[PDB]
Scaffold this active site. Structure first.
Site, PDB file in Angstrom:
ATOM      1  N   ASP A   1     -20.979 -36.944 -40.332  1.00 25.80           N
ATOM      2  CA  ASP A   1     -19.716 -37.108 -41.040  1.00 25.80           C
ATOM      3  C   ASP A   1     -20.019 -37.465 -42.488  1.00 25.80           C
ATOM      4  O   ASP A   1     -20.583 -38.527 -42.763  1.00 25.80           O
ATOM      5  CB  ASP A   1     -18.862 -38.193 -40.382  1.00 25.80           C
ATOM      6  CG  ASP A   1     -17.474 -38.305 -40.994  1.00 25.80           C
ATOM      7  OD1 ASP A   1     -17.130 -37.488 -41.873  1.00 25.80           O
ATOM      8  OD2 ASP A   1     -16.723 -39.220 -40.591  1.00 25.80           O
TER       9      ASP A   1
ATOM     10  N   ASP B   1      -6.274 -41.429 -39.332  1.00 26.05           N
ATOM     11  CA  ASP B   1      -7.524 -41.319 -40.071  1.00 26.05           C
ATOM     12  C   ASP B   1      -7.255 -41.810 -41.488  1.00 26.05           C
ATOM     13  O   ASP B   1      -6.546 -41.152 -42.259  1.00 26.05           O
ATOM     14  CB  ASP B   1      -8.035 -39.880 -40.070  1.00 26.05           C
ATOM     15  CG  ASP B   1      -9.334 -39.714 -40.841  1.00 26.05           C
ATOM     16  OD1 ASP B   1      -9.948 -40.735 -41.222  1.00 26.05           O
ATOM     17  OD2 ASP B   1      -9.743 -38.557 -41.070  1.00 26.05           O
TER      18      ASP B   1
ATOM     19  N   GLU C   1     -15.090 -43.200 -36.879  1.00 28.98           N
ATOM     20  CA  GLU C   1     -14.702 -41.815 -37.141  1.00 28.98           C
ATOM     21  C   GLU C   1     -15.575 -40.801 -36.408  1.00 28.98           C
ATOM     22  O   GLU C   1     -15.020 -39.845 -35.835  1.00 28.98           O
ATOM     23  CB  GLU C   1     -14.694 -41.574 -38.655  1.00 28.98           C
ATOM     24  CG  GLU C   1     -13.598 -42.341 -39.382  1.00 28.98           C
ATOM     25  CD  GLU C   1     -13.804 -42.389 -40.884  1.00 28.98           C
ATOM     26  OE1 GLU C   1     -14.759 -41.753 -41.376  1.00 28.98           O
ATOM     27  OE2 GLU C   1     -13.012 -43.071 -41.570  1.00 28.98           O
TER      28      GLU C   1
ATOM     29  N   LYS D   1     -10.702 -47.563 -50.333  1.00 29.23           N
ATOM     30  CA  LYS D   1     -11.591 -47.733 -49.189  1.00 29.23           C
ATOM     31  C   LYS D   1     -13.007 -48.085 -49.626  1.00 29.23           C
ATOM     32  O   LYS D   1     -13.747 -48.730 -48.875  1.00 29.23           O
ATOM     33  CB  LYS D   1     -11.587 -46.458 -48.345  1.00 29.23           C
ATOM     34  CG  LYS D   1     -12.228 -46.585 -46.978  1.00 29.23           C
ATOM     35  CD  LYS D   1     -12.071 -45.286 -46.205  1.00 29.23           C
ATOM     36  CE  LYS D   1     -12.720 -45.366 -44.837  1.00 29.23           C
ATOM     37  NZ  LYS D   1     -12.590 -44.084 -44.090  1.00 29.23           N
TER      38      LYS D   1
HETATM   39  N1  LIG Z   1     -14.855 -26.978 -49.877  1.00 30.57           N
HETATM   40  C1  LIG Z   1     -15.409 -28.125 -50.312  1.00 30.57           C
HETATM   41  N2  LIG Z   1     -16.540 -27.963 -50.981  1.00 30.57           N
HETATM   42  C2  LIG Z   1     -17.070 -29.084 -51.496  1.00 30.57           C
HETATM   43  N3  LIG Z   1     -16.563 -30.329 -51.424  1.00 30.57           N
HETATM   44  C3  LIG Z   1     -15.408 -30.426 -50.743  1.00 30.57           C
HETATM   45  C4  LIG Z   1     -14.791 -29.361 -50.176  1.00 30.57           C
HETATM   46  N4  LIG Z   1     -13.595 -29.655 -49.587  1.00 30.57           N
HETATM   47  C5  LIG Z   1     -13.516 -30.978 -49.787  1.00 30.57           C
HETATM   48  N5  LIG Z   1     -14.592 -31.488 -50.525  1.00 30.57           N
HETATM   49  C6  LIG Z   1     -14.836 -32.859 -50.951  1.00 30.57           C
HETATM   50  O1  LIG Z   1     -14.883 -33.693 -49.780  1.00 30.57           O
HETATM   51  C7  LIG Z   1     -14.218 -34.965 -49.993  1.00 30.57           C
HETATM   52  C8  LIG Z   1     -12.994 -35.074 -49.042  1.00 30.57           C
HETATM   53  O2  LIG Z   1     -13.467 -35.200 -47.703  1.00 30.57           O
HETATM   54  P1  LIG Z   1     -12.553 -36.006 -46.682  1.00 30.57           P
HETATM   55  O3  LIG Z   1     -11.137 -35.643 -46.876  1.00 30.57           O
HETATM   56  O4  LIG Z   1     -13.064 -35.741 -45.315  1.00 30.57           O
HETATM   57  O5  LIG Z   1     -12.943 -37.416 -47.204  1.00 30.57           O
HETATM   58  P2  LIG Z   1     -12.315 -38.690 -46.596  1.00 30.57           P
HETATM   59  O6  LIG Z   1     -12.166 -38.613 -45.118  1.00 30.57           O
HETATM   60  O7  LIG Z   1     -11.085 -39.138 -47.279  1.00 30.57           O
HETATM   61  O8  LIG Z   1     -13.511 -39.595 -46.996  1.00 30.57           O
HETATM   62  P3  LIG Z   1     -14.169 -40.633 -46.052  1.00 30.57           P
HETATM   63  O9  LIG Z   1     -14.168 -40.164 -44.638  1.00 30.57           O
HETATM   64  O10 LIG Z   1     -15.537 -40.822 -46.550  1.00 30.57           O
HETATM   65  O11 LIG Z   1     -13.437 -41.905 -46.155  1.00 30.57           O
HETATM   66  C9  LIG Z   1     -13.776 -34.977 -51.474  1.00 30.57           C
HETATM   67  O12 LIG Z   1     -14.746 -35.625 -52.302  1.00 30.57           O
HETATM   68  C10 LIG Z   1     -13.710 -33.486 -51.813  1.00 30.57           C
HETATM   69  O13 LIG Z   1     -13.848 -33.257 -53.223  1.00 30.57           O
HETATM   70 MG   LIG Z   2     -13.202 -38.938 -43.511  1.00 28.54          MG
END
Ligand SMILES: Nc1ncnc2c1ncn2[C@@H]1O[C@H](COP(=O)(O)OP(=O)(O)OP(=O)(O)O)[C@@H](O)[C@H]1O
Ligand SMILES: [Mg+2]
Length: 599
Positions: A193, A7, A170, A69
């Protein structure tokens, strides 16, 4: 030997494997099940990926890259990229082909190389867990990624030394992870998502017809520039404006202050998902000759919701579009599955529940399901996972520009993939040497409002009256969602050479060069690590020898004691420098003359 699922998220990346029939997430060298997508280039030449890179962000802002990304597959002149140019501490530039690249240490670098650094860290983690080389991988992309971004992600996979066996959406990976344990009761699900930078919605059917679990993507939609980064941006803008009102200083002129404020806003946004109110405290955010200035501002959950409600509502319309495309209604959705960290916000959950009229399931991990689904996809490709079938769809309508600038669809949106279309093309001018076809992706009726894939020129047409030559052009969409254009003369059967112009992406020579550059970077990281280990060993030896001198030194003869006082300084001379071998040689001579003090 074993295919791993990666991922590749905007903010956090994850890796999973098929331990037999059981999917298993692997922890990185720091102990975390997920790795932040932050890449840092040190002056020493060490390439830092993940949490350590974040640690050095404050001291190396120009050479620390994140949210790559959000730039991958985009052109420099895009409005989103132009907006990000003035915000990101690292320099974003236009490449020679007009794509958005980054500039690190004076070197132009494509986003695929930077993402390949993270992919290399995940590959190294998988190899460390398995103890065997890993050369094949499944890499995830947002469902709503266009052709250019998918191709760029595949290029990033190739640069990392991984054979990209499959590019998987995803939401589809989340569907696989959910269907692994509860895909058997002929259930229609909506996968919502919302990650760090991208939003997707997929309506997917899961059925157990005749003993094989089939996942069919009924519909897909989303927005590739909507995510938690925008929530953070809203909060940061509010905090900057309030601080300027309170103290008269605009923090946008201070890059270090902006980095610290980004970190504080991220923490406050995360804390407001559990707490009803938080306090942003950034002491010593800046200093004038009058003294230090401190930020201390209360933020309630209501304030954050008022700041991000429009983004949350922007995520709602693709739900309606996907439901219309699937031909269903909210009552026809059996399960709602939330994915991504940003869905942890109570407002998002409330909005989704109000939209569908039912509460989302709590038995899905929002941060790990995508990697699990990618690993499941890898297992399907090798036969380790049996009785599983997948039928995904193209997220965007493929089309061509025709007379008057109007868009002419050739393959409609939500068409299942892989797929093949064929159409006859001919010359519009007498004795026309070449026929050009402008191919684009998008739902807009005007060609100028769609993502252009480029001008494909069938060149070398033998002279003939206009309309006489008959060239069958075939557009194939593979399982990765990547378009492949071919052409052949339907009369003779001979293939027609297609020359692509004004397209976005990397050519083969660039990709080979970038693979070699990645190998060079890996070797430079190892040299920096060996040097670090050598310095630690030298410091340990110096301290040990000083301890031996303190306990036994006075009993030791004066000649060697007085000589070694400066002899250890001789070792120090190399120890202060960037020498690895000579430090070891001086350490050897110091140890050989300290041998009498060792025993
Ligand atoms: N408990 C939470 N409350 C609010 N926001 C959160 C929480 N936990 C994570 N985030 C936010 O969610 C985002 C991270 O999500 P995730 O790790 O799934 O993103 P990612 O997979 O890297 O992004 P994408 O899939 O869009 O490429 C960050 O912006 C983070 O600040
Ligand atoms: Mg993601």
């Amino acid at each position: 030997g074993k295919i791993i699922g990666i991922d590749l998220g905007t903010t956090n990346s994850c890796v999973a494997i098929m331990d037999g029939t059981t999917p298993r997430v692997l922890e990185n060298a720091e102990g975390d099940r997920t790795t932040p997508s932050i890449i840092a280039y040190t002056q020493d030449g060490c390439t830092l990926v993940g949490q350590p890179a974040k640690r050095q962000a404050v001291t190396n802002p120009q050479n620390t890259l994140f949210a790559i990304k959000r730039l991958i597959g985009r052109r420099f002149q895009d409005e989103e990229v132009q907006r990000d140019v003035s915000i990101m501490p690292f320099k974003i530039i236009a490449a020679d082909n007009g794509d958005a690249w980054v500039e690190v240490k004076g070197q132009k670098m494509a986003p695929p190389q930077i993402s390949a650094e993270v992919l290399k860290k995940m590959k190294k983690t998988a190899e460390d867990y398995l103890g065997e080389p890993v050369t094949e991988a499944v890499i995830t992309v947002p469902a709503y990624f266009n052709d250019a971004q998918r191709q760029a992600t595949k290029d990033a996979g190739r640069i990392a030394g991984l054979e990209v066996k499959r590019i998987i959406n995803e939401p589809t990976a989340a569907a696989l992870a959910y269907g692994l344990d509860k895909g058997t009761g002929n259930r229609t699900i909506a996968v919502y998502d919302l990650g760090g930078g991208a939003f997707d919605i997929s309506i997917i059917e899961i059925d157990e017809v005749d003993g094989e679990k089939t996942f069919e993507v009924l519909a897909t939609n989303g927005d590739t520039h909507l995510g938690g980064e925008d929530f953070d941006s809203r909060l940061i803008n509010y905090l900057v404006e309030e601080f300027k009102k309170d103290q008269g200083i605009d923090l946008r002129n201070d890059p270090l202050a902006m980095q610290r404020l980004k970190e504080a806003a991220e923490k406050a946004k995360i804390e407001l998902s559990s707490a009803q109110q938080t306090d942003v405290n950034l002491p010593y955010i800046t200093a004038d000759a009058t003294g230090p200035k401190h930020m201390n501002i209360k933020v309630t959950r209501a304030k954050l919701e008022s700041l991000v409600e429009d983004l949350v509502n922007r995520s709602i319309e693709p739900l309606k579009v996907a439901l219309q495309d699937a031909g269903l209604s909210v009552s026809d959705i059996d399960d709602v599955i939330l994915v991504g960290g940003q869905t942890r916000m109570p407002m998002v959950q409330k909005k989704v529940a109000e939209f569908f009229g039912k509460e989302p399931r709590k038995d899905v991990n929002p941060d790990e399901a995508v990697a699990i689904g990618a690993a499941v996809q890898g297992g399907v490709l090798t036969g380790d996972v049996k009785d599983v079938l997948l039928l995904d769809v193209t997220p965007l309508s493929l089309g061509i520009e025709t007379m008057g600038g109007v868009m002419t669809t050739l393959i409609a949106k939500n068409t299942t993939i892989p797929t093949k279309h064929s159409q006859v093309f001919s010359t519009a001018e007498d004795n026309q040497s070449a026929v050009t076809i402008h191919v684009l992706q998008g739902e807009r009726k005007r060609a100028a409002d769609n993502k252009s894939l480029g001008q494909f020129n069938l060149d070398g047409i033998n002279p003939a009256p206009r309309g006489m030559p008959q060239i069958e052009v075939t557009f194939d969409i593979d399982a990765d969602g990547i378009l492949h254009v071919s052409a052949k003369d339907k009369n003779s059967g001979k293939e027609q050479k297609i020359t692509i112009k004004a397209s976005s992406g990397l050519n083969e020579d660039e990709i080979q060069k970038m693979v070699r550059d990645a190998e060079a970077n890996a070797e430079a990281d190892r040299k920096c690590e060996e040097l670090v280990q050598t310095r630690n060993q030298g410091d340990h030896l110096l301290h040990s020898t000083r301890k031996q001198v303190e306990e036994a030194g006075d009993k030791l003869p004066a000649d060697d004691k007085t000589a070694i006082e400066s002899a250890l300084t001789a070792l120090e001379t190399a120890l202060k420098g960037e020498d690895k071998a000579a430090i070891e040689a001086k350490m050897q001579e110091l140890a050989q003359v300290s041998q009498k003090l060792m025993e």
